[PDB]
Design an enzyme around this catalytic site. Structure first.
Site, mmCIF file in Angstrom:
data_model
loop_
_atom_site.group_PDB
_atom_site.id
_atom_site.type_symbol
_atom_site.label_atom_id
_atom_site.label_comp_id
_atom_site.label_asym_id
_atom_site.label_seq_id
_atom_site.Cartn_x
_atom_site.Cartn_y
_atom_site.Cartn_z
ATOM 1 N N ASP A 19 0.853 -1.272 0.092
ATOM 2 C CA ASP A 19 -0.130 0.036 0.138
ATOM 3 C C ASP A 19 0.792 1.237 0.087
ATOM 4 O OD1 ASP A 19 -1.925 -1.731 0.581
ATOM 5 O OD2 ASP A 19 -1.687 -1.269 2.945
ATOM 6 N N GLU A 71 -14.532 0.933 4.061
ATOM 7 C CA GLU A 71 -14.846 1.088 2.940
ATOM 8 C C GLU A 71 -16.020 0.627 2.588
ATOM 9 O OE1 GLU A 71 -11.909 -1.992 2.303
ATOM 10 O OE2 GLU A 71 -10.360 -0.490 1.647
ATOM 11 N N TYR A 118 -10.415 -7.856 -3.111
ATOM 12 C CA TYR A 118 -11.282 -6.725 -3.588
ATOM 13 C C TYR A 118 -11.729 -6.995 -4.887
ATOM 14 C CZ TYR A 118 -9.217 -3.569 -0.115
ATOM 15 O OH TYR A 118 -8.823 -2.964 1.324
HETATM 16 C C1 SKD Z 1 -5.565 4.056 1.689
HETATM 17 C C2 SKD Z 1 -5.131 2.638 1.925
HETATM 18 O O1 SKD Z 1 -4.087 2.435 2.581
HETATM 19 N N1 SKD Z 1 -5.892 1.667 1.354
HETATM 20 C C3 SKD Z 1 -5.597 0.292 1.881
HETATM 21 C C4 SKD Z 1 -6.048 -0.264 2.987
HETATM 22 O O2 SKD Z 1 -7.039 -1.329 2.795
HETATM 23 C C5 SKD Z 1 -6.054 -2.093 2.285
HETATM 24 C C6 SKD Z 1 -6.577 -3.651 2.269
HETATM 25 O O3 SKD Z 1 -6.187 -4.436 1.511
HETATM 26 O O4 SKD Z 1 -7.282 -3.857 3.256
HETATM 27 C C7 SKD Z 1 -5.893 -2.114 0.644
HETATM 28 C C8 SKD Z 1 -5.996 -0.537 0.436
HETATM 29 O O5 SKD Z 1 -5.287 0.002 -0.826
HETATM 30 O O6 SKD Z 1 -4.849 -2.173 2.775
HETATM 31 C C9 SKD Z 1 -4.768 -0.896 3.525
HETATM 32 C C10 SKD Z 1 -5.165 -1.173 5.113
HETATM 33 O O7 SKD Z 1 -6.248 -2.072 5.374
HETATM 34 C C11 SKD Z 1 -5.136 -0.018 5.783
HETATM 35 O O8 SKD Z 1 -6.431 0.441 5.851
#
Ligand code: SKD
Length: 679
Positions: free
Chosen positions: A238, A515, A633
């Site tokens: 990330d 999200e 996702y």
């Molecule tokens: C802005 C951002 O960091 N987005 C991330 C968050 O969500 C994810 C995930 O796979 O869960 C992938 C997204 O691209 O990893 C991060 C983690 O969860 C911290 O929130």
């Protein structure tokens, strides 16, 4: 040992735990002594066993359980080999998670794999379904000839102390064993005979990125289908990395896609195809000083046909986890302006602002400076564009070396070596397009409303939503989440994207990864489904066009993890079983991102009013593959024909063992007939 095919077999059914002996084959004596070679086989697994050997050669006797060679697959789609003659002599292993699949559109399918043991180059290579998956290099090259006491050649298992270990169950469609090392080209070709789903973005395309994540898919009112995704250059890490947002479109209902473009990108660090290390040490390393964009959202204003692309804008070396608390803006004369720090001032002295016409002002003297920025936020000193050297990144052992090159790039306010640096928090960026991606507008940073008490305020990736009916018809909405006074939030526009208003949907201060995606009810009210920090997906409802939201209610019956995973939920244009329907996609496992399912929810009018007016019955669920197969996702889209398109991560994107895998973002289509289990 003769040159060429030593052994070949076709259509072999293997009962789970039984295996199949190839000891009587004419070439068994040669296979048991191979100094190198190539094995290629087509198989269909009907077993749920954890580890399943496809082909093996070794010593079956007592005490010799660590003397064998085998090519295997796992119930979670992994593939690999183990070349052993006891750990004291040698134990060579090579594998790649999420390389094969088990089920596609309700039926078990064949996968084609190959292992090449190249003595001349002292190299081992694994292939599957048309792709080179992994490579192992060894100075002391070893093969079957180096195993002590080989006494068997077996299909569907590995003989260990007279027992069938790593039991396979299914069919070996075909197997060919060569004494010679076939070329990578022949193997890509040979294994490419079986592929499922398609790639939109892929390692080797014009984005120059080896990795992709965070899918967005949207069918426009014109019939064109568009998509976006993070082009993650430095592995699948990330932000606080080098990431750009990729875009592509299809004008034939999702059959073929255009060359991808990069609408949101930074140039402080070079965009290049690099193989990120997957070892226990290097896998954790990430680019430290690059600016990036992350998590895309696509949206269409059906009234103007204009499309918008939103994403988080991360300054150099910043990510959601290390973002500074603050808005990044300063209010002067009642108007909020982006603040800047002169590189020679104190570490936290943001005494300048970017005002009208990109002119940079000295706030203390309230006088304009000799500097300014263009619509791309690149610096100029008296009309002369400022530049700085672009960085390159390469591994020296387990160390990532980030060094300047001699390539000059325009100095941008979000770059680490800029003379004027932006506040180190995250921003919300967007561009619009009226020609379906042929050209995009200037960079619009819409986050002036970011609460000064917030650490980060970011988007819920996927797509946005435009209200089609009711008092607020025409309003544009984009889901958000943050670590501040509220967790879930939204930004909406009543003037077709020209201006945005921020809304706090709750009073949670935990900053979980909430999200969310938005769906519209028949009367125009809205229901938002979101990932939470608890073991459930939550539902919230709004009867005032998204201005206020009800308390969270767990979505009963749809299992998930505590850490959670992003979800996709969309409105379907036609009724299903005579009722308005919504469709949801998410991995269904309670631990691990796997067992992806597409659900169909039928909207029922309860007879009540307000927030209790509607109730969604999740009547159908469709399993995309087997329970252990990776699925993270995703983003759904109703295609111009009746079909439902799906762009998703076919692996576990949370797992520390499945990082940095190429070509895992797959595009698949499903009919409502299929989805409702109606064949
Ligand atoms: C802005 C951002 O960091 N987005 C991330 C968050 O969500 C994810 C995930 O796979 O869960 C992938 C997204 O691209 O990893 C991060 C983690 O969860 C911290 O929130």
């Amino acid at each position: 040992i003769p040159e060429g095919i030593l052994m070949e077999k076709n259509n072999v059914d293997i009962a789970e735990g039984q295996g199949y002996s190839l000891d009587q084959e004419a070439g068994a004596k040669y296979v048991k002594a191979m100094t190198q070679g190539t094995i290629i086989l087509s198989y269909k697994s009907t077993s749920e066993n954890g580890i399943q050997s496809l082909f093996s050669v070794g010593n079956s006797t007592a005490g010799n359980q660590d003397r064998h060679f085998h090519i295997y697959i796992t119930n979670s789609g992994g593939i690999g080999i183990e070349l052993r003659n006891t750990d004291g002599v040698f134990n060579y292993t090579l594998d790649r998670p999420a390389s094969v699949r088990a089920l596609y559109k309700g039926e078990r399918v064949f996968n084609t794999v190959a292992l090449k043991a190249d003595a001349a180059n002292k190299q081992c290579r694994l292939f599957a379904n048309g792709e080179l998956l992994a490579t192992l290099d060894k100075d002391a090259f070893k093969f079957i000839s180096d195993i002590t006491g080989v006494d068997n050649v077996t299909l569907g298992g590995t003989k260990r102390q007279g027992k069938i270990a790593y039991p396979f169950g299914g069919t070996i469609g075909d197997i060919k064993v060569y004494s010679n090392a076939l070329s990578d080209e022949e193997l890509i070709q040979a294994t490419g005979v079986t592929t499922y789903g398609e790639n939109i973005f892929y390692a080797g395309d014009v984005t120059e990125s080896n990795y992709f994540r965070i899918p967005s898919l949207l069918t426009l009112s014109t019939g064109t289908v568009i998509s976006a995704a993070d082009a993650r250059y430095g592995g699948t890490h990330d932000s606080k990395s080098k990431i750009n947002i990729a875009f592509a479109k299809s004008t034939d209902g999702g059959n073929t896609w255009s060359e991808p473009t990069l609408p949101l990108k930074f140039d402080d660090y070079i965009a290049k195809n690099i193989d990120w290390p997957r070892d226990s040490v290097g896998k954790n390393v990430q680019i430290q000083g690059s600016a990036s964009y992350i998590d895309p959202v696509l949206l269409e204003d059906k009234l103007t046909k204009r499309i918008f692309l939103f994403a988080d804008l991360m300054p150099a070396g910043i990510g959601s986890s290390n973002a500074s608390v603050g808005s990044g803006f300063k209010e002067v004369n009642g108007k909020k302006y982006l603040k800047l720090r002169w590189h020679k001032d104190a570490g936290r002295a943001y005494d300048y602002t970017i005002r009208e016409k990109g002119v940079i002002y000295n706030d203390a003297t309230n006088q304009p400076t000799e500097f300014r920025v263009d619509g791309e936020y690149n610096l100029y000193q008296h009309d002369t564009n400022l530049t700085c050297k672009q960085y390159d990144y390469n591994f020296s052992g387990n160390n990532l070396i980030e060094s300047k090159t001699d390539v000059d790039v325009n100095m941008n306010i979000f770059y680490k070596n800029s003379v004027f640096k932006a506040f180190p928090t995250n921003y919300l960026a967007m561009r619009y397009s009226d020609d379906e991606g042929a050209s995009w507008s200037d960079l619009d940073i819409v986050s002036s409303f970011k609460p000064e008490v917030s650490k980060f305020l970011v988007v819920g990736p996927g797509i946005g939503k435009q209200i089609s009916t009711g008092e607020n018809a025409g309003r544009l909405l984009v889901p958000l989440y943050s670590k501040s006074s509220a967790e879930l939030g939204f930004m909406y526009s009543d003037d077709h994207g020209d201006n945005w208003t921020y809304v706090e949907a709750d009073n949670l201060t935990g900053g979980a990864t909430a999200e969310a995606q938005i769906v519209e009810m028949p009367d125009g009210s809205l229901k938002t489904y979101l990932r939470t920090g608890s073991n459930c997906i939550a539902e919230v409802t709004s009867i005032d066009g998204g201005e206020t939201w009800s308390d969270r209610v767990p979505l009963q019956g749809i299992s998930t993890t505590s850490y959670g995973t992003q979800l996709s939920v969309i409105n379907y244009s036609q009724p299903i079983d005579g009722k308005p329907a919504i469709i949801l996609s998410s991995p269904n496992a309670t631990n691990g991102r796997k067992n992806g399912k597409i659900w169909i929810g039928l909207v029922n009018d309860t007879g009540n009013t307000g927030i209790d007016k509607y109730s969604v019955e999740w009547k159908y669920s469709y399993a995309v593959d087997t329970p252990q197969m990776g699925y993270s996702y995703s983003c759904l889209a109703e295609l111009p024909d009746g079909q439902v398109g799906l762009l998703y991560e076919k692996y576990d994107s949370w797992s520390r063992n499945e990082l940095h895998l190429k070509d895992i973002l797959k595009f698949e289509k499903y009919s409502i007939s299929e989805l409702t289990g109606q064949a």
